[PDB]
């Protein structure tokens, strides 16, 4: 006789995934965010479906439909604001996950790191396309600006922006295409996340100390299932606080206005999670330089495995690198704050300095600090 | 990496694969021209410019 | 299920030829037509009768609809 | 081997033709549809504008700017700071029309719509980052580094006009 | 043989195979489109718009 | 009960690779312009679709300019008239759908943008229904204002006989006999239902030739690769 | 040091699932349909997305949007009719696949068979919700009839029906939720197809003879890749003939009429691939009995591995069983035709006899005949 | 004809000006914004609205 959990192929995959997977016993709370992302994803999908069941995708009846969701559908406002704030929770967990990967040297797992970068790209694309769907003033003008950025591409720029627009501006065609891509993309994200977990399992998780945890391993089920359950409950508490008490805290009030193409908002800004890159593109004067810096701000995560030079994988035993990492985090928050602020002195100078310092830390200060680090330990 | 790949045998391998890689690049260029129907290039080849 | 532990054979010899030495259509019509005719002969006495009775039923029902549809002299 | 691989080569050529003529179908579907391919022929007319009045309509999904150039600008602004003015341009270079200058409604600094009849002169003041525009569309003060591009004005007979 | 020359001139290398396929498709698209359009116009001669544009 | 199915007429486009006779399409559009548009409506097609099919660009823009079309708000919010443009759909004779029934006996004229592709039978029906009017047979009395047509289901249409010989004058000068008018308007309605008809047939010709080329070659490739197994000769030599 | 094809994790899965998979050497052309369905699935998804980018799931605009797709979108008509006729081809291949499984005793694979039944049910649901989207007369009224079917279930009944309707009857809300469910479902179908393949691979495949083929397995890549490619080319030939020569061959003309709820079309029939169920519906006088028979017609496939009594897996060496199976197929076409026709004296009795025969062959004639054959063959 | 009838419960709030362009014309040229979302569409909410009306 065979145990069904270890013999049934479906239960075999589940067992090797998160039942008897050997995981380090000393992984901190910062790892829970991984599961949270998946949890958020699942929640998002559910809410997304219940939003797609009352949302037309026509310019004439987009915004009104959303109001019909909030004002007429039984328990509709809860689903709508659950989606809106779950997007912010998703991005909070995504940023914390990226920070954890940077800190404890989890980017040394190359394939998982690259798959994660692809997942990041897809998640930002999906969220941007989703924000257009309510067809508020902010959605329309943000889509207009972002797609107008693509006109800076040489030779094939204007054709590309006209093509994506499905015309000559953001209109019914663009809204419908954005709805379709917003629908399909999260399933691609799910497949990519499955691939991410697959690549991760062939090497096992990395502990905070960086040293291989092969000698000290515990089964995933009796410990980390309940630990991730507690993490999911805490994230649910925070998300529900946002939804029930300040639903439009992380939301521009201008979005609650029909998208009028004949009147711009006095201030145009993306959502908060998109500001860190947005301000970066604001720093570079050249239009194509802005696009290149925008793509580099995220693609620079690819160079992390190559730029690593310290003999130790993790950062628990590298104080100077720790100060550098927290400098980078503070700089990211600086860029996020600046992006929302209008372009004007002194924000131009501070934004330029913040972007320059970000790139300097990522490419120069960290490897040089690691090389200095090695000498202090006689290696 | 900066010096391990810089070797006489590696340089010879590069020379060996120069024809293959170069005409693979030519393959890609011609395929891109054909797929995008690039008039700026296709306007010069005879009997194909008649399409436009 | 991968190659190596599929089954056990002994004293079995398989001769084969390169695909570049044989003709991909060796006696396509000379031997193919008799084989197709033999296969049709073997299968038709079992496959045809249900379809022919289906055709009879279909025609009968289609004609039955009209005369029930047709005018009744009264 | 030549014959056997010639079969494969002809197969691959046919498949390439089919693949192009299949992917192009979808790509062209994702381009602009025929209904929005009826554009750039707006039949607006100039008989609603004297000097200073500044209507703006919709065209190609963007605002356009129909404004009677004021009796001042036609004579002075054509030579007001013609040296640099942050961009070199003469008034009738903008439009052959000497009384019905028309522009596009995208302020050429970041992407916006300058509200009409405002500014230190009063032509077009961009609500976003200030950047007033002259009544003929010129830029003198403001973060805006370039003037409004003027759409191809295929002015028809009499009042009726065509932009684009 | 012509086929043998074609093989060991332009078929042996898979990259040369790809180049041959690319150029062959380049010419075949034009040839096939021309032939099919000519045939289709021949079948419906006088029934298409292109055959009556001259009248109006 | 009973209904009379329309006979399969020998249409010019009936052929597997045949195309709509676009001259007949132009004449049928004329018929719709001065006969059917008076009470019947067509929406999904516009003057723009006429170019490159039956009318040239100048003729199409003149046709659009002839009609008067309601526009958006005026400088104070009025409903000002406007000469139609190429980007204007064909005007609807009656403003609200109920007004069409009110003007008629009570049955609204169906839109012809799909009437060929929505009625079971196709053009043969729409043609014959026009050229099928006859005096009702004895024993079946029709209501006042109703008309007997064998092909129409129920045999009681609300049409005044629309097409009769010498109703309109074709621009070409072909005779205006009732059968000619019906045939040309039926061809135009088929074009209206399927604008891509000619392009569909052209692509079908291309597909037929391309598959007749590819399928033998791919079958040859399959035979080539499988010939290792279809020519193998087994042998058994137990000790 | 090792080939990437069988060392890289994703490459290893692809290798041992499509390249080096040992398959029987004598699988006939029928097995090719297993590939075609999957290809059809992709062709259904990839084309379907391109309809979602110009389709607005609103009652006031759904039909108008579809007409816009077919008349104004560049090559939109190709996408629309390719999608419709590809769904028809999907059902053709699905029925042929079920016939192959039933014939050559494949239902001994149990897990794969049940997963296939679930996939079949999901596909019928997907097509049902799909037909509603154009919002034609037949779409609207077929949706009305099929949803009103569920009123026959006891107790919950009307409450469940109105829950599906999102109101008192089919309306804008019903259209929107049908569109959303239709969008989500095919990805669930894709995951279920992956599970189907996973279950199938553990045991191999059933060759036409029905005997174990472990002594004649061949690598998949050199042979069956090109064989299934030829099959897909043939399926493309048929599908493209349907699309480009008779687009509406398998389609009611009345769907080209905007859905008017105030007029019942003279004929109310579902799509051609549902009639065999609908005819069974027409057979049973009782509404609850009708719905139970309708679901049991498809559910009976689960009982097949329990109803097989012959000591021979395949049907290749069993003549009377072959005659019974072909009688079953003819009965299926008879049911389809009967469902197509209205409900009058010539057709009612034929429908009753056809339904009784369809159940009797599966549940009674086939097992008893297998007993007769076993006795006749000295075992 | 587009006749007249007393409003019922299901009916939405009345709209004084037929088209928004008529609304602009009736006033100096500005558009009175819809009040269904004013509080949560303007930075400040009820505080801003109260200050605007009484300030
Ligand atoms: C519906 C969905 C769309 C279609 C799905 C198709 C799925 C299967 C695709 C692959 C396939 O066709 O496999 C079956 C089958 C696989 O066997 P094969 O490669 O033909 O080799 C012959 C057999 O061994 C069998 O050989 P044989 O003993 O019959 O004699 C040799 C040969 C000679 O007989 C014939 O060719 C038959 C007479 C016509 C000539 O037989 C055939 O070719 C039989 C097939 C008919 C041709 O191939 C065909 O049926 C050929 C398709 C038609 C030819 C290509 C197009 C022209
Ligand atoms: C001459 C008189 C008519 C002969 C054909 C009718 C007939 O009942 O033949 C039975 C006769 C005897 O059946 P069998 O070969 O013992 O059993 C069928 C094979 O196991 C499985 O079939 P197969 O792999 O031996 O042969 C494939 C066959 C038929 O392929 C299929 O039946 C599957 C795909 C096509 C489905 C039906 C499309 C219509 O291909 C063709 O017939 C030509 C190409 C059709 C499309 C590609 C396949 O078979 C044939 O003549 C060829 C296969 C059936 C053709 C229908
Ligand atoms: C980059 C490869 C060339 C792309 C391109 O523009 O090809 C020309 C063709 C047609 O252009 P063309 O060949 O008529 O001339 C170039 C025209 N501009 C400069 C506007 C691009 O491009 C396309 O068909 C699509 C362009 C985007 C492709 C991605
Ligand atoms: C998703 C992850 C959790 C589920 C998969 C992993 C767990 C094993 C499978 C599910 C399970 O709990 O099965 C219980 C039981 C197994 O059979 P049993 O004889 O109890 O034990 C020996 C064989 N495993 O199987 C049973 O069916 C038990 C009887 C029904 C439940 C009471
Ligand atoms: C937050 C404030 C608390 C905090 O992070 O304190 C630092 C603490 C250090 O923990 P430890 O590595 O055990 O310290 C060893 C010291 N010899 O803990 C850490 O350093 C862990 C937190 C950093 C790594 C986890 C990911 C979060 C990083 C900050 C946000 C990331 C997103 C934005 C930047 C990208
Ligand atoms: C990536 C695709 C979009 C490229 C960007 C762009 O601007 O494309 C323009 C154009 C889109 O189609 P367009 O020509 O506008 O259609 C007119 C109406 N039929 O682009 C095109 O028409 C073609 C663009 C090239 C990509 C499609 C054709 C090649 C597909 C691969 C073939 C080989 C496999
Ligand atoms: C009409 C049927 C298709 C045309 C070909 C005729 C045919 O099906 O012949 C039956 C064929 C016989 O060959 P075989 O599978 O070896 O069975 C034992 C033969 N002594 O056996 C088969 O073809 C069996 C195929 C079963 C699955 C496909 C047919 C049923 C589809 C239902 C939908
Ligand atoms: C779609 C969102 C994502 C999901 C659902 C996801 C899922 C997961 C999960 C569940 C884990 C295991 C738990 C953990 O260690 O955190 C994990 C690990 C990991 N992920 Fe992600 N991830 C996502 C995005 C990313 C991103 C953006 C990156 C960085 C580019 C990334 C890189 C990693 C790395 C390096 C690990 C291993 C961490 C370690 O072993 O300590 N992931 N991922
Ligand atoms: C990757 C996970 C997802 C993210 C991050 C995401 C993000 C967003 C965001 C930010 C919005 C704008 C909300 C607002 O402005 O009020 C939105 C709206 C929407 N999303 Fe998503 N979404 C996700 C998944 C989905 C899925 C799977 C669907 C489809 C089932 C979906 C359907 C919608 C719809 C219909 C809207 C419009 C309703 C609204 O804007 O409130 N979303 N999404
Ligand atoms: C399981 C495979 C699928 C089947 C069997 C299926 C079936 C159908 C059917 C029968 C129609 C009606 C077509 C018509 O009457 O003209 C339809 C329409 C539609 N389907 Fe699907 N579908 C499938 C997959 C998809 C997917 C994956 C999407 C989304 C990406 C999708 C989106 C649509 C849309 C938007 C329509 C309306 C377009 C139209 O009017 O034809 N379908 N589908
Ligand atoms: C969503 C539609 C389906 C897809 C994509 C699918 C996919 C596949 C594929 C690719 C195969 C291997 C090729 C073959 O053996 O023919 C297969 C085998 C099989 N499928 Fe399906 N299938 C589907 C529906 C079904 C259904 C409805 C059933 C029956 C309930 C079923 C039962 C089987 C069985 C028994 C086999 C094994 C046949 C054998 O190898 O001898 N499948 N399926
Ligand atoms: S966009 Fe008008 S000034 Fe910046």
mmCIF file with all atom_site columns, N, CA, C and O in Angstrom, chain A residues 149-150 152-154 277 280-281 284 286-300 359:
data_model
loop_
_atom_site.group_PDB
_atom_site.id
_atom_site.type_symbol
_atom_site.label_atom_id
_atom_site.label_alt_id
_atom_site.label_comp_id
_atom_site.label_asym_id
_atom_site.label_entity_id
_atom_site.label_seq_id
_atom_site.pdbx_PDB_ins_code
_atom_site.Cartn_x
_atom_site.Cartn_y
_atom_site.Cartn_z
_atom_site.occupancy
_atom_site.B_iso_or_equiv
_atom_site.pdbx_formal_charge
_atom_site.auth_seq_id
_atom_site.auth_comp_id
_atom_site.auth_asym_id
_atom_site.auth_atom_id
_atom_site.pdbx_PDB_model_num
ATOM 1   N N  . UNK A 1 149 ? 4.520  58.603 -24.009 1.00 0.00 ? 149 UNK A N  1
ATOM 2   C CA . UNK A 1 149 ? 5.936  58.317 -23.781 1.00 0.00 ? 149 UNK A CA 1
ATOM 3   C C  . UNK A 1 149 ? 6.523  57.419 -24.861 1.00 0.00 ? 149 UNK A C  1
ATOM 4   O O  . UNK A 1 149 ? 7.683  57.597 -25.249 1.00 0.00 ? 149 UNK A O  1
ATOM 5   N N  . UNK A 1 150 ? 5.751  56.450 -25.353 1.00 0.00 ? 150 UNK A N  1
ATOM 6   C CA . UNK A 1 150 ? 6.281  55.524 -26.346 1.00 0.00 ? 150 UNK A CA 1
ATOM 7   C C  . UNK A 1 150 ? 6.596  56.207 -27.668 1.00 0.00 ? 150 UNK A C  1
ATOM 8   O O  . UNK A 1 150 ? 7.330  55.642 -28.486 1.00 0.00 ? 150 UNK A O  1
ATOM 9   N N  . UNK A 1 152 ? 8.560  58.471 -28.054 1.00 0.00 ? 152 UNK A N  1
ATOM 10  C CA . UNK A 1 152 ? 9.977  58.809 -28.042 1.00 0.00 ? 152 UNK A CA 1
ATOM 11  C C  . UNK A 1 152 ? 10.839 57.715 -28.651 1.00 0.00 ? 152 UNK A C  1
ATOM 12  O O  . UNK A 1 152 ? 12.017 57.959 -28.931 1.00 0.00 ? 152 UNK A O  1
ATOM 13  N N  . UNK A 1 153 ? 10.289 56.522 -28.855 1.00 0.00 ? 153 UNK A N  1
ATOM 14  C CA . UNK A 1 153 ? 11.069 55.438 -29.461 1.00 0.00 ? 153 UNK A CA 1
ATOM 15  C C  . UNK A 1 153 ? 11.457 55.836 -30.880 1.00 0.00 ? 153 UNK A C  1
ATOM 16  O O  . UNK A 1 153 ? 10.605 56.341 -31.636 1.00 0.00 ? 153 UNK A O  1
ATOM 17  N N  . UNK A 1 154 ? 12.708 55.655 -31.289 1.00 0.00 ? 154 UNK A N  1
ATOM 18  C CA . UNK A 1 154 ? 13.112 56.084 -32.631 1.00 0.00 ? 154 UNK A CA 1
ATOM 19  C C  . UNK A 1 154 ? 12.406 55.285 -33.712 1.00 0.00 ? 154 UNK A C  1
ATOM 20  O O  . UNK A 1 154 ? 12.017 54.132 -33.512 1.00 0.00 ? 154 UNK A O  1
ATOM 21  N N  . UNK A 1 277 ? 9.281  55.163 -10.196 1.00 0.00 ? 277 UNK A N  1
ATOM 22  C CA . UNK A 1 277 ? 9.791  55.243 -11.554 1.00 0.00 ? 277 UNK A CA 1
ATOM 23  C C  . UNK A 1 277 ? 9.417  56.557 -12.221 1.00 0.00 ? 277 UNK A C  1
ATOM 24  O O  . UNK A 1 277 ? 10.238 57.136 -12.941 1.00 0.00 ? 277 UNK A O  1
ATOM 25  N N  . UNK A 1 280 ? 11.654 59.290 -11.567 1.00 0.00 ? 280 UNK A N  1
ATOM 26  C CA . UNK A 1 280 ? 12.914 59.008 -12.247 1.00 0.00 ? 280 UNK A CA 1
ATOM 27  C C  . UNK A 1 280 ? 12.871 59.536 -13.672 1.00 0.00 ? 280 UNK A C  1
ATOM 28  O O  . UNK A 1 280 ? 13.789 60.231 -14.124 1.00 0.00 ? 280 UNK A O  1
ATOM 29  N N  . UNK A 1 281 ? 11.783 59.254 -14.390 1.00 0.00 ? 281 UNK A N  1
ATOM 30  C CA . UNK A 1 281 ? 11.685 59.764 -15.750 1.00 0.00 ? 281 UNK A CA 1
ATOM 31  C C  . UNK A 1 281 ? 11.557 61.281 -15.745 1.00 0.00 ? 281 UNK A C  1
ATOM 32  O O  . UNK A 1 281 ? 11.968 61.949 -16.701 1.00 0.00 ? 281 UNK A O  1
ATOM 33  N N  . UNK A 1 284 ? 15.234 62.908 -15.903 1.00 0.00 ? 284 UNK A N  1
ATOM 34  C CA . UNK A 1 284 ? 15.936 63.003 -17.180 1.00 0.00 ? 284 UNK A CA 1
ATOM 35  C C  . UNK A 1 284 ? 15.198 63.983 -18.084 1.00 0.00 ? 284 UNK A C  1
ATOM 36  O O  . UNK A 1 284 ? 13.994 63.816 -18.326 1.00 0.00 ? 284 UNK A O  1
ATOM 37  N N  . UNK A 1 286 ? 15.736 64.601 -21.421 1.00 0.00 ? 286 UNK A N  1
ATOM 38  C CA . UNK A 1 286 ? 15.508 64.034 -22.744 1.00 0.00 ? 286 UNK A CA 1
ATOM 39  C C  . UNK A 1 286 ? 14.343 63.052 -22.715 1.00 0.00 ? 286 UNK A C  1
ATOM 40  O O  . UNK A 1 286 ? 14.221 62.233 -21.801 1.00 0.00 ? 286 UNK A O  1
ATOM 41  N N  . UNK A 1 287 ? 13.483 63.139 -23.732 1.00 0.00 ? 287 UNK A N  1
ATOM 42  C CA . UNK A 1 287 ? 12.281 62.310 -23.758 1.00 0.00 ? 287 UNK A CA 1
ATOM 43  C C  . UNK A 1 287 ? 12.625 60.830 -23.859 1.00 0.00 ? 287 UNK A C  1
ATOM 44  O O  . UNK A 1 287 ? 12.056 60.003 -23.137 1.00 0.00 ? 287 UNK A O  1
ATOM 45  N N  . UNK A 1 288 ? 13.552 60.473 -24.750 1.00 0.00 ? 288 UNK A N  1
ATOM 46  C CA . UNK A 1 288 ? 13.967 59.078 -24.847 1.00 0.00 ? 288 UNK A CA 1
ATOM 47  C C  . UNK A 1 288 ? 14.789 58.663 -23.637 1.00 0.00 ? 288 UNK A C  1
ATOM 48  O O  . UNK A 1 288 ? 14.731 57.500 -23.216 1.00 0.00 ? 288 UNK A O  1
ATOM 49  N N  . UNK A 1 289 ? 15.569 59.588 -23.079 1.00 0.00 ? 289 UNK A N  1
ATOM 50  C CA . UNK A 1 289 ? 16.283 59.288 -21.853 1.00 0.00 ? 289 UNK A CA 1
ATOM 51  C C  . UNK A 1 289 ? 15.341 58.951 -20.717 1.00 0.00 ? 289 UNK A C  1
ATOM 52  O O  . UNK A 1 289 ? 15.639 58.095 -19.883 1.00 0.00 ? 289 UNK A O  1
ATOM 53  N N  . UNK A 1 290 ? 14.187 59.615 -20.673 1.00 0.00 ? 290 UNK A N  1
ATOM 54  C CA . UNK A 1 290 ? 13.196 59.277 -19.668 1.00 0.00 ? 290 UNK A CA 1
ATOM 55  C C  . UNK A 1 290 ? 12.707 57.848 -19.794 1.00 0.00 ? 290 UNK A C  1
ATOM 56  O O  . UNK A 1 290 ? 12.612 57.127 -18.802 1.00 0.00 ? 290 UNK A O  1
ATOM 57  N N  . UNK A 1 291 ? 12.404 57.416 -21.020 1.00 0.00 ? 291 UNK A N  1
ATOM 58  C CA . UNK A 1 291 ? 11.940 56.047 -21.231 1.00 0.00 ? 291 UNK A CA 1
ATOM 59  C C  . UNK A 1 291 ? 13.035 55.051 -20.877 1.00 0.00 ? 291 UNK A C  1
ATOM 60  O O  . UNK A 1 291 ? 12.775 54.006 -20.264 1.00 0.00 ? 291 UNK A O  1
ATOM 61  N N  . UNK A 1 292 ? 14.274 55.344 -21.276 1.00 0.00 ? 292 UNK A N  1
ATOM 62  C CA . UNK A 1 292 ? 15.373 54.433 -20.979 1.00 0.00 ? 292 UNK A CA 1
ATOM 63  C C  . UNK A 1 292 ? 15.607 54.319 -19.479 1.00 0.00 ? 292 UNK A C  1
ATOM 64  O O  . UNK A 1 292 ? 15.813 53.217 -18.962 1.00 0.00 ? 292 UNK A O  1
ATOM 65  N N  . UNK A 1 293 ? 15.571 55.442 -18.760 1.00 0.00 ? 293 UNK A N  1
ATOM 66  C CA . UNK A 1 293 ? 15.703 55.388 -17.310 1.00 0.00 ? 293 UNK A CA 1
ATOM 67  C C  . UNK A 1 293 ? 14.527 54.664 -16.673 1.00 0.00 ? 293 UNK A C  1
ATOM 68  O O  . UNK A 1 293 ? 14.707 53.933 -15.695 1.00 0.00 ? 293 UNK A O  1
ATOM 69  N N  . UNK A 1 294 ? 13.324 54.852 -17.214 1.00 0.00 ? 294 UNK A N  1
ATOM 70  C CA . UNK A 1 294 ? 12.150 54.148 -16.710 1.00 0.00 ? 294 UNK A CA 1
ATOM 71  C C  . UNK A 1 294 ? 12.333 52.640 -16.804 1.00 0.00 ? 294 UNK A C  1
ATOM 72  O O  . UNK A 1 294 ? 12.102 51.914 -15.832 1.00 0.00 ? 294 UNK A O  1
ATOM 73  N N  . UNK A 1 295 ? 12.745 52.150 -17.974 1.00 0.00 ? 295 UNK A N  1
ATOM 74  C CA . UNK A 1 295 ? 12.921 50.708 -18.120 1.00 0.00 ? 295 UNK A CA 1
ATOM 75  C C  . UNK A 1 295 ? 14.112 50.221 -17.301 1.00 0.00 ? 295 UNK A C  1
ATOM 76  O O  . UNK A 1 295 ? 14.074 49.118 -16.739 1.00 0.00 ? 295 UNK A O  1
ATOM 77  N N  . UNK A 1 296 ? 15.174 51.027 -17.198 1.00 0.00 ? 296 UNK A N  1
ATOM 78  C CA . UNK A 1 296 ? 16.341 50.617 -16.429 1.00 0.00 ? 296 UNK A CA 1
ATOM 79  C C  . UNK A 1 296 ? 16.031 50.516 -14.946 1.00 0.00 ? 296 UNK A C  1
ATOM 80  O O  . UNK A 1 296 ? 16.568 49.638 -14.268 1.00 0.00 ? 296 UNK A O  1
ATOM 81  N N  . UNK A 1 297 ? 15.155 51.385 -14.433 1.00 0.00 ? 297 UNK A N  1
ATOM 82  C CA . UNK A 1 297 ? 14.862 51.399 -13.005 1.00 0.00 ? 297 UNK A CA 1
ATOM 83  C C  . UNK A 1 297 ? 14.399 50.037 -12.511 1.00 0.00 ? 297 UNK A C  1
ATOM 84  O O  . UNK A 1 297 ? 14.630 49.686 -11.349 1.00 0.00 ? 297 UNK A O  1
ATOM 85  N N  . UNK A 1 298 ? 13.754 49.258 -13.372 1.00 0.00 ? 298 UNK A N  1
ATOM 86  C CA . UNK A 1 298 ? 13.304 47.922 -13.023 1.00 0.00 ? 298 UNK A CA 1
ATOM 87  C C  . UNK A 1 298 ? 14.236 46.853 -13.576 1.00 0.00 ? 298 UNK A C  1
ATOM 88  O O  . UNK A 1 298 ? 14.500 45.857 -12.906 1.00 0.00 ? 298 UNK A O  1
ATOM 89  N N  . UNK A 1 299 ? 14.750 47.043 -14.795 1.00 0.00 ? 299 UNK A N  1
ATOM 90  C CA . UNK A 1 299 ? 15.611 46.032 -15.392 1.00 0.00 ? 299 UNK A CA 1
ATOM 91  C C  . UNK A 1 299 ? 16.944 45.910 -14.675 1.00 0.00 ? 299 UNK A C  1
ATOM 92  O O  . UNK A 1 299 ? 17.648 44.914 -14.866 1.00 0.00 ? 299 UNK A O  1
ATOM 93  N N  . UNK A 1 300 ? 17.306 46.893 -13.848 1.00 0.00 ? 300 UNK A N  1
ATOM 94  C CA . UNK A 1 300 ? 18.576 46.842 -13.143 1.00 0.00 ? 300 UNK A CA 1
ATOM 95  C C  . UNK A 1 300 ? 18.597 45.718 -12.122 1.00 0.00 ? 300 UNK A C  1
ATOM 96  O O  . UNK A 1 300 ? 19.667 45.340 -11.639 1.00 0.00 ? 300 UNK A O  1
ATOM 97  N N  . UNK A 1 359 ? 20.904 55.140 -8.804  1.00 0.00 ? 359 UNK A N  1
ATOM 98  C CA . UNK A 1 359 ? 21.737 54.381 -9.729  1.00 0.00 ? 359 UNK A CA 1
ATOM 99  C C  . UNK A 1 359 ? 23.148 54.212 -9.182  1.00 0.00 ? 359 UNK A C  1
ATOM 100 O O  . UNK A 1 359 ? 23.753 53.144 -9.328  1.00 0.00 ? 359 UNK A O  1
#
